[PDB]
RNA sequence: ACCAAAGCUAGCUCAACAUACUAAACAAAUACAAAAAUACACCAAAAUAAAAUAAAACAUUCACCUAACAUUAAAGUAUAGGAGAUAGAAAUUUUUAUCCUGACGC
RNA sequence: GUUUAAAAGAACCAACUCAUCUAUGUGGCAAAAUAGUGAGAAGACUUGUAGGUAGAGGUGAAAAGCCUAACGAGCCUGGU
RNA sequence: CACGCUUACAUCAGUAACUAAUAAUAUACUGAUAAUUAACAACCAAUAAACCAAAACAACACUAAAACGUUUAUUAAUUACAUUGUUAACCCAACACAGGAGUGCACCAAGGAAAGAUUAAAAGAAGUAAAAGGAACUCGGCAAACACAAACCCCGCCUGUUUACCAAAAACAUCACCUCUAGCAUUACUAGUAUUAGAGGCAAUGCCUGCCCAGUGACACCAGUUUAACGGCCGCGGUAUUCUGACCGUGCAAAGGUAGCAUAAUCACUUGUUCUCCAAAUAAGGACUUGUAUGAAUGGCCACACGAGGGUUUUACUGUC
RNA sequence: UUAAUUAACUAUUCCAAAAGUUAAUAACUUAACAUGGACUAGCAAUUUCGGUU
């Protein structure tokens, strides 16, 4: 084949030993006694230096097998920045869930009900979009890394403004960068959703099951789509040092145990650094599944069994202008076999909050043709956002 | 052209040329880029108690001086170890193998302040 | 156009082209330093 | 390195010429040291070996001025030290073979006091002498204790 | 001063790596090739020319991969294609009609029956029909496709005798190799590459071609239409 | 009458002898971009002298030309040389220890 | 900035980069400048910093150009 | 602010003389004494894995394929205050030099002074205005102008590059078209593979590129092939009344200059002859044309657009006259 | 350069050296280097340009 190392760039081989080292029963006269190199004398060979006292910073990195958590079986870890090739398909296979396009009927009713709207919804959301895209920064054109989390927090506050009408949203709390770890063995493959998400809403009261028993039973007749050339573990980190322990983001006795909504942000100024929409949907599905598995194993136990009480989690992925909503109902825990009941997931994809935004007024032929502000606005996206927020109460 | 006779200090270079003026280092660089100062590297000034010390920076002008007798190794030995070794040899318990009782040190690496490596500044 | 200003000062280039390390890293620069020492120059390099 | 006349005529051009030997990578086996060295030798080297009827014979017979090789001098020094020490590491399982090998090279037996100084250059010899004479300075406490013991013994014997 | 090469990367990756161009300068610093330098900034997409390369040594049998995207490569005149099989992806040289969402086979099995040659498929020369168009052919089994790679170019299999295959290169020269040498079937992508028209002298500078020297040189005896016969067949089989 | 002019010293030069030959200073810092206390290496290399000139040109040649054998003769001899310009030995001979060192040198 | 479905080696014209023509200057402001006037001005564009190629050579969209104010081959030292 | 110079910066005091190309006095001379205080800037983690999907308001695209990043796993001394750059009127040009100098802000809210004092000679430089004429000046409409337009040729397709400091061009390069040289791997070419890469010629495009391997080269190691290889493509005499020669005789060649254009940027004769332009032309343009020394990729003929290239007209304009 | 003497280096080819192979003294091959002597070319080196008029 073609080796990828160039000889002139690789570590050069040590020079050949002096001819005095090949004579048996002869001591070499080197320059080791003068503590410096001197021509004409042999090159002294030194044993590997032993720092009898160890130093933390200036020691060689210990190998991977020396670690006490090292295991022989390879675990496929999915962290925050793991990309999937066949995103939705791989996620559905790894989580054993069935995909549905539209949002659940409960959240759809909660959205379409005009009584659940804010006072001035159109103007409020337009002002939030304008403040996020233009006003929040002193620069002319703010960057995505600044206007994505700002718009997410603005929508979160617009939803929080509904607590005076619904005195039940106070049962929630927010969390940032909490270590989640949910490992499961599926088809003789040890997968593990492990890492930290963007934002996590927790609540005191659980989310009621949204899938009907008819849908749960019809899920038995549904088969998962398979991809032959690609392995389901494509894009995951194959590691050997890991812990098979259901460690959620919090300890025991947490007053807000039930996860309500995960929030993922694609706040990167570069297209290659951002996530694709399909990969973002897969990431949010996998992390919602990890949260649901952690909650289920903390509630009922680590035994693999179909849950008589499903676990409903929500997730929102924001590119800055594109929103992806997910409602995942976990119903089973045994995932090695592909014959039993599967979970459900409703994924509303490609929800445009606004088409474009002009931070500066365009002028063509000495006349302004489009003023400053968002061009095109779909309030149904914020309606679904508010439905997902109020789904708990 | 530039000057060659003047000293090459840190004031005469670009921003990336920051040469010290001769002070000793007091730590290292931590994790977030800040400087972690080590309290063992900073010199601890050992100051005595000058309250009841009856000695002044100057001496009496009428006080007499002495002949210059620079203290030597032979004189120090005669003052600290010659009487002890002489008494030990007169008593007959002299041990040429063990000389640690008279003040001799076989290896300097044991004690704190060694003499040849000079672990102490002052 | 107008000449005479061919010298644009820069300490990095100065010390990298005529510095002590630059002189000592080559056997010819060592000979230069030895010649300057034999003549008795106050400044051997920049 | 020299000069030559093209067309072998004095009245013609003078041209610098470098005559080089034909080097060969050959493997030579030594009986005293018991090792096969992959050395760059010449046809004249092989001819001298065949004339001396042995690699070790050639090494032990041709002096430094005829070897002109630091590696050859090192080989000679090694085999001379082995012959002077009667090294059992030559053949620990064949004492008869070791003795038979040591007998046929009896004409070049040199004592140990001179067998470790033949294949050394001036720098190597100075380094060896420095390593031999490298002694730590004894503390003045020892000298003063010895002087005091001498004085005490003198005062004890003078009574 | 002596410069170091930018090709210090032992681990194969699919992501494009940055490369430092050098205009005709060797590692010393003097011009070795004239008319090179000052092009567009480019990245390097590492191509896997050993087509038949299984993921793990436990299953060395033939394998099928899926094409994800056919992309443009500034380093070569052909188009590259990302193919994924198992747990890894790799860049290969796309054939003429290779599109996104195709399946490519990579086999090393030779049988008494010839196989139906598709485009993305890669079988040894001993398993292909006698009149098959091929590309990315090999010299020795397992050496790698050094031969035909350019856009639109393709060789043709002529005959197979004594377990040795004879091919014909785009230079109309015959090349004899072992029949176990893997080769990709079909023509290389971008068949219209020769028909491209550099619109101006600036596109050559974009590509990284410095203008020719202005020195007028009188033609020597080398010039003129030299009608030379075809050179003998280049054989790579080692006959004991 | 201004401008100006004159000192006799600082010191140098050539030899003899000579211990036997990289002076004194080296507290700290000095081959990081020298004089910047402090981190897992890489270190080192050799391959003829050439030409200006003379041969009234210039092609073979051209004493000395940074390699010890000194002195008296052999001897500018034998020899080597576009046998031109020029180059040039040897065999064999002679050479008595120390002080008397300073200067028709500035 | 303006014209253009155009960032088109497009057009007008600033900053900027070159130097067409003329007049002063010619021991001058200047060992190559000033004033007016010109050419390009989204590109084969200008430009900052740092590095490389060294003279029997380097580099050159060949002017036998440039390589620290004198280059048909730099300068310094030595031969001298 | 960066780069660069290092105290030239600040306060007090003095200037007879030294520096300011002269004084007044002083940021530029002299002496003494003081000063630039970190939050800004410099020094300020490695080892493996997931990572193809540009920046241009980036919604999404084009080609020339494009710097700028997080997450996960293992180790990262752990304990206030570390070290260094902080002035200026300044740098490179022998100078307190009308020159050369990167970046972000604004066109003044900040910087400064063309005149040491008189008179109003010549000549010189810069500007403004000018009767009537309007290029009659001159090599040329150079310069200037209340003008700032329209055409015809030569040479280069065009943008571009060049003799820093007398030549910017018709020179070079150039897209395009042709030749040769190469079947291939760890430092150029190239991490490429004949639709590729080098050594060259000529110049976009359009119509074409005619004959010749005799000589010299190069492949062929001799024959033989090659001119989009170096280069060459004919004499003498008579002929259809009186002018030419379709034609013929004879001789040598490897072929004997084909198409095209032509008094040209093309030896001399040449200011060739003729028509247009002017009152007048060795100017310009169009024709005739052996140019016995044009000529076809050392390329030949036309054409758009272009050119501070070289010439010629028409008005307009004006002190060029 | 179609001047006179011809080096080094780079591409050819040949002989010798070195490695070897076949048969009862002969014939034959050279992967990377690589030494000595010749051959053909590139890149090139030294020197010169008689005098009267
Ligand atoms: Mg100086
Ligand atoms: Mg500095
Ligand atoms: Mg600075
Ligand atoms: Mg600190
Ligand atoms: Mg100068
Ligand atoms: Mg390329
Ligand atoms: Mg390409
Ligand atoms: Mg070309
Ligand atoms: Mg040319
Ligand atoms: Mg002469
Ligand atoms: Mg003379
Ligand atoms: Mg002469
Ligand atoms: Mg002469
Ligand atoms: Mg000489
Ligand atoms: Mg003779
Ligand atoms: Mg003569
Ligand atoms: Mg333009
Ligand atoms: Mg000007
Ligand atoms: Mg004017
Ligand atoms: Mg201007
Ligand atoms: Mg313009
Ligand atoms: Mg223009
Ligand atoms: Mg440099
Ligand atoms: Mg010469
Ligand atoms: Mg040259
Ligand atoms: Mg020329
Ligand atoms: Mg010329
Ligand atoms: Mg010069
Ligand atoms: Mg200065
Ligand atoms: Mg004055
Ligand atoms: Mg002052
Ligand atoms: Mg300041
Ligand atoms: Mg006046
Ligand atoms: Mg004034
Ligand atoms: Mg005045
Ligand atoms: Mg006047
Ligand atoms: Mg006037
Ligand atoms: Mg006027
Ligand atoms: Mg008038
Ligand atoms: Mg006139
Ligand atoms: Mg006139
Ligand atoms: Mg004009
Ligand atoms: Mg005009
Ligand atoms: Mg006009
Ligand atoms: Mg032009
Ligand atoms: Mg055009
Ligand atoms: Mg240029
Ligand atoms: Mg010029
Ligand atoms: Mg220029
Ligand atoms: Mg000019
Ligand atoms: Mg021009
Ligand atoms: Mg041209
Ligand atoms: Mg054509
Ligand atoms: Mg031409
Ligand atoms: Mg043409
Ligand atoms: Mg032709
Ligand atoms: Mg021929
Ligand atoms: Mg012929
Ligand atoms: Mg005509
Ligand atoms: Mg003529
Ligand atoms: Mg006229
Ligand atoms: Mg002609
Ligand atoms: Mg011609
Ligand atoms: Mg020709
Ligand atoms: Mg024109
Ligand atoms: Mg131009
Ligand atoms: Mg022009
Ligand atoms: Mg000749
Ligand atoms: Mg000579
Ligand atoms: Mg010459
Ligand atoms: Mg003559
Ligand atoms: Mg004459
Ligand atoms: Mg005459």
List keywords for this structure.
part of a larger assembly; 5 chains; A: 393 residues; alpha+beta; 7-stranded mixed sheet; 7 helices; 15 strands; 23% helix; D: 159 residues; two-stranded antiparallel ribbon; two-stranded antiparallel sheet; elongated; binds magnesium ion; RNA-binding; Mitochondrial ribosomal protein L41 (chain B); mitochondrion (chain B); structural constituent of ribosome (chain B); ribonucleoprotein (chain B)
Present as ligands are: magnesium ion
Binned, the helix content of chain D reads 40-55%
User: What number of domains of chain D?
Assistant: 1
Taking the sheet with the most strands of chain D, its summary is: 2 strands, antiparallel
CATH class of the largest domain in chain E: Mainly Beta
Largest sheet of chain E: 7 strands, mixed
The total of beta strands of chain E comes to 13
Q: Please give the alpha-carbon distance between the first and last residues of chain E.
A: 47 Å
Sheet/helix structural class of chain D: alpha+beta
Q: What order do the helices and strands of chain D follow?
A: EEEEHHHHHHHH
**Whole-number total of structural domains of chain E:** 2
What overall geometry of chain E do the principal axes of the alpha carbons give? Answer: globular
CATH topology category name of the largest domain in chain E: OB fold (Dihydrolipoamide Acetyltransferase, E2P)
Protein name (chain C): Large ribosomal subunit protein bL34m
GO cellular component, one term (chain C): mitochondrial large ribosomal subunit
GO molecular function (chain C): structural constituent of ribosome
Organism (chain C): Sus scrofa (Pig)
Mind explaining what this structure looks like?
This is part of a larger assembly, with chains A (393 residues), B (122 residues), C (46 residues), D (159 residues) and E (240 residues). Chain C has 46 residues and is mostly helical. Helix content of chain C is 57%, strand content 0%. Chain C is elongated. In chain D, a hairpin with a 4-residue loop joins β3 (24-30) and β4. Chain E has one helix at 201-207, and strands at residues 17-18, 43-44, 63-72, 79-85, 88-93, 103-106, 122-124, 133-135, 155-161, 164-168, 174-178, 182-185, 234-235. Chain E has 2 domains: 1-107, OB fold (Dihydrolipoamide Acetyltransferase, E2P), CATH 2.40.50; 108-188, SH3 type barrels (Roll), CATH 2.30.30.30. Chain E starts with 16 loop residues before the first strand and ends in a 5-residue tail after the last strand. Classes of the chains: A alpha+beta (393), B little secondary structure (122), C mainly alpha (46), D alpha+beta (159), E mainly beta (240). The A-E interface holds A 1-2, 4-6, 8-10, 85, 227-231, 233-234, 238 and E 4-5, 7-12, 27, 46, 49-50, 53, 64-66, 68, 84-87, 89, 103, 142-144. The structure holds magnesium ion (73 copies). Residues 72-74, 77 of chain E line the site of one magnesium ion (MG). Chain E binds 4 RNA strands through β2, β3 and α1.
